Amino acid sequence: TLSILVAHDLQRVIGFENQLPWHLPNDLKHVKKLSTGHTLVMGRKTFESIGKPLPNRRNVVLTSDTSFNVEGVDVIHSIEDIYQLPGHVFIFGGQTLFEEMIDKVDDMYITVIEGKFRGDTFFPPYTFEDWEVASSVEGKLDEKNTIPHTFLHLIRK
């Protein structure tokens, strides 16, 4: 199983200056619950924007730099190595890799942030003619989750 895992705003912004534009602890829990015990694959820029591999799951970084080496990260050097990865594999970022993978993945777990942020990194355009909506769950607003958001699980038609 090969999935995308992304949070993007109303205009598909996912990042701004190496940072997430919004603070949404519920979506952090969503990511932990979905990806704990499985594989995250990310581009080099996405990985270095995080700075450390995420605990309790496999961390795979795609780069052409053959000296790249981090404690806790397995390196791949081509898209084609993604297909050799076992288990449930989530493509985690960034814009480039999503552009490389959005036409290949089985499904997408999207968190839609119901906001318009300033961004410099974008998720690819997609249309619901190609994706059926398996589930659509509103996030609960509260104390620390101040922005409306919605958990979509989209499956390719």
Ligand SMILES: NC(=O)C1=CN2[C@@H](CC1)O[C@H]1[C@H](O)[C@H](COP(=O)(O)OP(=O)(O)OC[C@H]3O[C@H](n4cnc5c(N)ncnc54)[C@H](OP(=O)(O)O)[C@@H]3O)O[C@@H]12
């Ligand atoms: N929520 C997110 O996902 C966010 C991600 N962001 C944000 C934080 C938000 O910080 C962004 C960086 O500006 C960056 C914007 O540039 P982007 O190219 O989209 O980032 P990628 O993670 O997709 O990294 C691309 C790198 O992996 C790359 N890569 C992509 N495809 C291949 C490939 N097919 N073969 C070998 N390497 C590849 C190659 O790595 P390298 O330069 O060290 O060789 C490439 O430069 O995205 C990071």
Ligand SMILES: CCc1nc(N)nc(N)c1C#C[C@H](C)c1cc(-c2ccncc2)ccc1OC
């Ligand atoms: C939590 C944000 C998020 N949600 C969903 N549903 N999918 C994603 N792919 C990302 C993401 C992201 C970027 C790579 C990112 C994650 C994290 C992060 C994610 C999970 N635990 C700790 C940090 C920190 C910084 C980051 O960019 C600056």
